[PDB]
Structure 1
Amino acid sequence: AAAIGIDLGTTYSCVGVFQHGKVEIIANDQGNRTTPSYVAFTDTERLIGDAAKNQVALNPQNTVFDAKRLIGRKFGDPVVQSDMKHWPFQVINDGDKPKVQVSYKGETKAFYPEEISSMVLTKMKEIAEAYLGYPVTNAVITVPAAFNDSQRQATKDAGVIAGLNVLRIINEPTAAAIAYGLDRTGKGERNVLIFDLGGGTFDVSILTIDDGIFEVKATAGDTHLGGEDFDNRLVNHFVEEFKRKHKKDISQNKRAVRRLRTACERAKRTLSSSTQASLEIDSLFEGIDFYTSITRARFEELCSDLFRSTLEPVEKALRDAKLDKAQIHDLVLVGGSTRIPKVQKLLQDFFNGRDLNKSINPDEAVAYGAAVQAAILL
């Protein structure tokens, strides 16, 4: 009975298992090795993951995401008050705890963030069970290093609600380091930088590892910088292109923008492995189709300031850790956006040509380390 490692992510989640001497990251029913952290409520069903994200444009008020930004916080937390202004779903106050309010099967219902996250975890659990062939009961679940006691408590509660025995809650940067075997040496300090650029957040952690013991020396980043901001740059570019080509402005049609955004995320992912991508959106606006293309070089130009802004938190973290660049032994890429070639070039250039640890898909590295640690704990 194998235990699983679960990366419960702000925008995407990922599950792996250590079995037969190696980790396997487990693909979902659609074949995707990561699954959106989305939950949708309709007149007839609750949708989780791909099915939820794939109907987001049809159902914005009842499609919940970003629950990790709420989990374990009080309603009056300035983070909650700030973030809620920009979600299409309703957040309400139940005894100074936030709840998401939706319509489901014709009725108004509210859920605590940990309940939303428990549904995402249930999906990851079922993804693993379909692969393994038997029920899964034990798991390691990861959290950001910045999470406090209440946020860790609520993440553990999400796991309990999903029917998991949570063996340990471990930090995301620690899990990434474990994935690359960086905690296996004996006496001797090793300095590791984790550069984690995901869908919604950017986190830099500097760890010192000595005889298997992890010590956080410094952290930095931006909780509102990630792949979604690169998608948004492409969206605005294509809104302008559509205006020039058809003299129609689509920006106020919430459905057309959301569907253009989905095609932009897909093209962005293609540009990490090809130098050009095609977009073909049928009936984007008023029956007008939108068939166009984007080059990698144009994408880099549209995001050049955003990509470059990731280096200042690295500088700051090094300052706070009292370390020079050359004193970092390993540079570990985490998060789907670190697959972007320009991002890798910026970081490698900043470190004067140093190797990047990127042999594990960066959007899977946290789950991979979590799966290793789950096996060790058994």
Structure 2
Amino acid sequence: APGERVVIGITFGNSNSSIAHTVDDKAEVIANEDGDRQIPTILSYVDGDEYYGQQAKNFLVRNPKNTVAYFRDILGQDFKSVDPTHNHASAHPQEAGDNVVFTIKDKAEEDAEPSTLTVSEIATRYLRRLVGAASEYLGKKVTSAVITIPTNFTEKQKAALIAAAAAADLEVLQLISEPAAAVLAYDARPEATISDKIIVVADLGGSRSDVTVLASRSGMYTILATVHDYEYHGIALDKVLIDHFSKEFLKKNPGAKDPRENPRSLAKLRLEAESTKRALSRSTNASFSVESLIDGLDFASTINRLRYETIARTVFEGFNRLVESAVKKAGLDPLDVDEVIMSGGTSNTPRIAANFRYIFPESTRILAPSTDPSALNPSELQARGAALQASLIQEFETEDIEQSTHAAVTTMPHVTNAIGVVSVSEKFVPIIAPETAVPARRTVHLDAPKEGGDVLVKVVEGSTHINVREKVWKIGSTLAEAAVRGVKKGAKVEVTINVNTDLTVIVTAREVGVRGTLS
């Protein structure tokens, strides 16, 4: 009912999920019964009891055949496109019809045949648990949610997600992209200022990396490019640390059998490497300790920031080549980017943020935890933005939302080139920024001449050009020429340009006037 509903924001990734709500028009991320705000997207079964989150990851080693994880991608996907690389730990998907299925023991009695649950069933159960934990935290029953999704989910995947939510008794008001949630999480803050910026969203997760280029003008954003890399990531860093520590164990015990063959040892090493890497992110030094890893023997060591960075250097330039690949795909230059937001768990590490600081000029602002005091948690950005959207959209009806989310509303003539005025001294000044959608009225204040009097406001077209590096403007076709009579010495002239839908351009040059229309 429009009068009564309960909305939340959900971020649902391959590695982990998160839930959030809004208190006093401010987004706050919800902790579950375990106290976690970043809840691993892992499900595990012991004696027929359903567990999720930290308990499941801890029980991962104990239960080989009853844990399911990294199933987010599998949703709404055909057998041909299944990606099983990260699913070695998870139970082997069995092609039943068109819907792969996991076979696990979800009953309490020990002599029961294991069930063959679908991926949709598993997502449904996970959404029930998430909603339930949100329900205990809020004291009320959660009824609605906005869930974030990547931009490359197919329509079949969206249908699978909505069907899973419906089976989980959760109606999805809207699906939003993680870059849009990240930008909204900042823009909807009290202290935020709307302004024309080139925004790069770098969402660095566990199994994936996303770099997205957006232009945000007048508080509205237009997608210029997006890239998704599945090769370089925190899991790959986990493997290189497991390798190096394995080395050290092999040297310390001459003859010790190789760790890789034993699954239990593999899982223990990965979980402990994850703990250690997070600790080394926390502070300068970190320690690694495994108990009864093999044959009851024990091991420990210590590692530090610089050594970890050296052993992990190659992935850092892999992230670099990804970011330049994305900028080249967007046809832009690092001098063209205004802000780069670091999102996702991997973004926290200071080194990567400093590396992008070295790649980009100082005029670019890097919003990352270690390089900016006013930054927000990259693991909380998506969930808080989703909660803020689920809050602000409450007023409209369900049909109203279906209509507001149709292509007839979102699509409109964005003006490619820039519109500006020519300044001369004894240069192109942009008023309408490039790639700006139809009626985005803008206003500039210019200086009068040395003595003033009659003054010429000549509005022309403009294009950006890079000179080796420094960005300059290039004057193109001339649009209009107006005159202001008797301007005072030192006065300011106000110039407004409005490029309304119909493509009509209204020009105003009033001193603090001449007005004109271009059909």
TM-score normalised by structure 2 residue count = 0.69
Match of 1:282 in 2: 291
- Secondary structure at the counterpart of residue 288 of structure 1: coil
- Runs ≥4 residues deviating over 6 A: 182-186
Opposite residue 181 of structure 1, the aligned amino acid is D
Match of 2:127 in 1: 121
**1-structure distance, mates of 2:232, 2:160:** 24
Query: Residue 221 and residue 350 in structure 1: after superposition, are their counterparts in 2 closer, same or farther (change >3 A)?
Result: farther
**1-structure distance, mates of 2:199, 2:87:** 37
Match of 1:131 in 2: 137
**2-structure distance, mates of 1:336, 1:226:** 11
**2-structure distance, mates of 1:189, 1:115:** 44
Alignment partner for residue 105 of structure 2, among 91, 103, 107? 103
Match of 1:198 in 2: 205
**2-structure distance, mates of 1:116, 1:212:** 38
Match of 2:12 in 1: 8
Query: Residue 81 and residue 276 in structure 1: after superposition, are their counterparts in 2 closer, same or farther (change >3 A)?
Result: closer
- Secondary structure at the counterpart of residue 72 of structure 2: helix
Match of 1:219 in 2: 226
**1-structure distance, mates of 2:86, 2:322:** 26
Number of residues paired by the alignment?
Answer: 375
Opposite residue 248 of structure 2, the aligned amino acid is E
Alignment partner for residue 167 of structure 1, among 173, 178, 187? 173
**1-structure distance, mates of 2:243, 2:85:** 22
**2-structure distance, mates of 1:69, 1:60:** 21
Q: 1:322 Cα shift? A: 2.0
| CA offsets 1:206-260 (integer angstroms, 9 cap, x no match) | 1123444432211113124321111111111111111111232322221122112
Q: Percent identity?
A: 33
Q: 1:371 Cα shift? A: 0.8
Match of 1:333 in 2: 342
**1-structure distance, mates of 2:96, 2:313:** 43
Give the number of the structure whose residues are more often strand, by fraction.
2
Match of 2:24 in 1: 20
Alignment partner for residue 342 of structure 1, among 316, 330, 351? 351
Q: 1:82 Cα shift? A: 5.1
1:207 aligns with 2:209: no
Query: Residue 85 and residue 45 in structure 1: after superposition, are their counterparts in 2 closer, same or farther (change >3 A)?
Result: closer
| CA offsets 1:277-322 (integer angstroms, 9 cap, x no match) | 1122221211111122111112112211012201222112211222
**2-structure distance, mates of 1:343, 1:156:** 36
Q: 1:344 Cα shift? A: 1.2
Opposite residue 22 of structure 2, the aligned amino acid is F
Q: Which is greater in Rg? A: 2
Match of 1:157 in 2: 163
Alignment partner for residue 291 of structure 1, among 270, 281, 300? 300
**2-structure distance, mates of 1:269, 1:324:** 33
How big is the alpha-carbon RMSD for the aligned residues of Structure 1 and Structure 2? 2.0
TM-score normalised by structure 1 residue count = 0.93
Match of 1:376 in 2: 392
**1-structure distance, mates of 2:160, 2:308:** 38
Stretches of structure 1 lacking an aligned partner (at least 5 in a row)? none
Higher relative contact order (CA 8 A, sep 6+): 1
Query: Residue 152 and residue 219 in structure 1: after superposition, are their counterparts in 2 closer, same or farther (change >3 A)?
Result: same
Query: Residue 83 and residue 279 in structure 1: after superposition, are their counterparts in 2 closer, same or farther (change >3 A)?
Result: closer
| CA offsets 1:109-152 (integer angstroms, 9 cap, x no match) | 22332322222322322232222111111100011111111111
Residue pairs, 1:179-328, within 5 angstroms: 179-181=185-187, 189-247=196-254, 248=256, 249-328=258-337
Q: 1:85 Cα shift? A: 7.2
Q: Is the 8 A contact 2:6 2:141 kept in 1?
A: no
Larger mean CA deviation between 327-336 and 80-89 belongs to 80-89
Query: Residue 15 and residue 246 in structure 1: after superposition, are their counterparts in 2 closer, same or farther (change >3 A)?
Result: same
Stretches of structure 2 lacking an aligned partner (at least 5 in a row)? 369-374, 395-519
**2-structure distance, mates of 1:306, 1:84:** 18
